[PDB]
């Protein structure tokens, strides 16, 4: 279990370790090491998703570890409340950034091991705190340089709690 302690409340997450083993290992390593502490949700698009795990207040992008294999061929779907890894164009480019689907986003789902089909790897889901996710998704946003949909007031992950068996 992972809990993001945000300045708007707790987001409580169950991870799908066996379905996305490299992804969950990467995520938990960042959690346990404090990487997500003092990071923001820097991209909030109502009716789509909320994204974080990369920037400190002031839009300061942190150094990450090397990227991970895309495990989206695990059959898990980007339904409302799931977490998936953000990434750039290359399939195996995810590092620390993740997003929470706020509606079902079928168009993000894996359809093939290809540039257009690889999709976005689901590795966890919110089990409590969707009210907090729903508060975040409705905040006022604007531009920061190249970035769009940046909350005008910082939505901050202050700390995390990891519990494992």
Question: What does this 3D model show about the protein?
Answer:
Keywords: Cytoplasm, Isomerase, Rotamase. Helices cover 12% and strands 35% of the residues. By secondary structure, the chain is mainly beta. The chain has a single domain, classed as Cyclophilin-like (Cyclophilin, Beta Barrel). It has an eight-stranded antiparallel beta barrel. The longest helix has 12 residues, at 21-32. The N and C termini lie close together (9 Å).
Features:
Non-canonical amino acids, isomerase, 8-stranded antiparallel β-barrel, Peptidyl-prolyl cis-trans isomerase, Cyclophilin, fluorinated valine, 12% helix, mainly beta, two-stranded antiparallel ribbon, 165 residues, 2 helices, monomeric
Structural class: mainly beta
CATH fold-level label: Cyclophilin
Any guess at the CATH architecture? Beta Barrel
The percentage of residues in β strands lies in: 35-45%
Assign a percent range to the helix content: 10-25%
**Rg over alpha carbons:** 15 Å
**Number of alpha- plus pi-helical segments:** 2
Largest sheet: 8 strands, antiparallel, barrel
Report the end-to-end length measured between terminal Cα atoms: 9 Å
Number of domains: 1
Give the SSE order as H and E letters. Answer: EEHEEEEEEEHEEE
How many strand elements? 12
Shape: globular
Order of adjacent strands in the largest pleated sheet: 1-2-9-7-8-4-3-12
Report the top-level CATH class. Answer: Mainly Beta
CATH homologous superfamily designation: Cyclophilin-like
